[PDB]
Ligand binder design. Structure first.
Ligand SMILES: OC[C@H]1O[C@@H](O[C@H]2[C@H](O)[C@@H](O)[C@H](O[C@H]3[C@H](O)[C@@H](O)[C@H](O[C@H]4[C@H](O)[C@@H](O)[C@H](O[C@H]5[C@H](O)[C@@H](O)[C@H](O)O[C@@H]5CO)O[C@@H]4CO)O[C@@H]3CO)O[C@@H]2CO)[C@H](O)[C@@H](O)[C@@H]1O
Lengths: 202, 202
């Protein structure tokens, strides 16, 4: 459904390679098109990684959900300065908008980043380029799949110690589509590439 | 007073420059002497940075509180492998210990690290080398002091956007001693070492 509301602007700045915004993105988007959303819409970070098509006075742009705006009511987006300028007059401070969450946004293959400080005792995993909301992230333990816990900062974490070796992870999106990612290394901070996608390229 | 209990062992491993343990230390101590403590002893990260003098079968060693052991009861320490080996037989798995928190531990001057991703809209500060528990961290805002919020991960964070310009931060410890740190820079990731100490060197 389309949400009708308003936008203000802010900036994460140029950022870093560790954690940008409440979603802890590996980078600020190169095009600087990102948005912080209300706490309900952030949904305990379940909205992290998703995209919104936002229409304002000047037209329509796409922004990555990057962050949480605690003071934004539902329907109020805190856009990047760049996204704001593309849609309206910067000095207006606030502009009327309408927006939708993009289904299957065009994107690269799924990637995985292990959190700094992770080990066999405790680890966080971040799922990059899923495109849509992720419902479950599980690590193989023999015949079973052990569920990781969704944090409110864009990672999924181990409830209990895991093995001292290669990791197989299954990620299931909100539409029930799953990818299985084998051979993942306990390599904190590194973005590990895969060949896997939730949906074909168009 | 003195706590009597038990120790097990675990490892943070080699570590990184971003966040080590739940206290998010800038580094695993060079001497690998650290400990994860029970949730009540962790006290919402208030124990972060403090030291324990731990007595076991082989003698006494000092460990830095670096981490939280959710599964530990009060009196149960999860020591680094190195600290464990210093106190007892590694393969025993569990050793009897007694311990106390060190008052005014010998150490360097106070340092401040601004969290990666910080800006004027939102920032986190980490206070390093206070030695004892910190009770308050405030940022100067004219004639007022704005209170930062203690997170459970070793930082203190802004409740609201702050002014621009040089930061002046006041840190007050559990004994009511305050240090004032002027000229601090919005420099995410950098350890900013200051001239201040809560107590003289001995
Ligand atoms: O068994 C425990 C286990 O702990 C390990 O240590 C972990 C700890 O478990 C994790 O919880 C902890 O997680 C923190 C991340 O490291 C940290 O980067 C992340 O930072 C967030 C912050 O939480 C969030 O509030 C902040 O929000 C702001 C946005 O950034 C701004 O842009 C916006 O304007 O305002 C919002 C606030 O309104 O975002 C930052 C990220 O950018 O917080 C996580 C905790 O909540 O990490 C520890 C280290 O990995 C320990 O290592 C294990 O040994 C131990 O077993």
């Amino acid at each position: 459904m389309t949400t009708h509301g308003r936008a203000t602007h802010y900036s994460l700045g140029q950022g870093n390679t560790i954690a940008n915004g409440n979603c802890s993105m590996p980078a600020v988007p190169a095009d600087r098109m990102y948005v912080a959303v209300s706490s309900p819409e952030y949904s305990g970070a379940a909205a992290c990684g998703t995209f919104l098509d936002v229409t304002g006075p000047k037209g329509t742009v796409r922004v990555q959900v990057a962050d949480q705006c605690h003071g934004c009511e539902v329907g109020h987006l805190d856009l990047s300065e760049e996204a704001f300028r593309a849609l309206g007059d910067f000095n207006a401070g606030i502009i009327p908008i309408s927006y939708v969450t993009v289904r299957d946004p065009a994107g690269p293959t799924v990637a995985i980043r292990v959190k700094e400080g992770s080990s066999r005792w405790w680890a966080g995993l971040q799922v990059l380029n899923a495109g849509n909301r992720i419902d479950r992230v599980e690590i193989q333990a023999g015949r079973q799949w052990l569920p990781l816990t969704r944090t409110d900062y864009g990672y999924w974490v181990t409830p209990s110690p895991i093995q001292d070796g290669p990791l197989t992870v299954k990620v299931t999106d909100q539409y029930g589509r799953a990818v299985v990612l084998p051979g993942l290394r306990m390599a904190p901070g590194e973005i590990q590439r895969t060949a896997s996608r939730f949906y074909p390229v168009h």
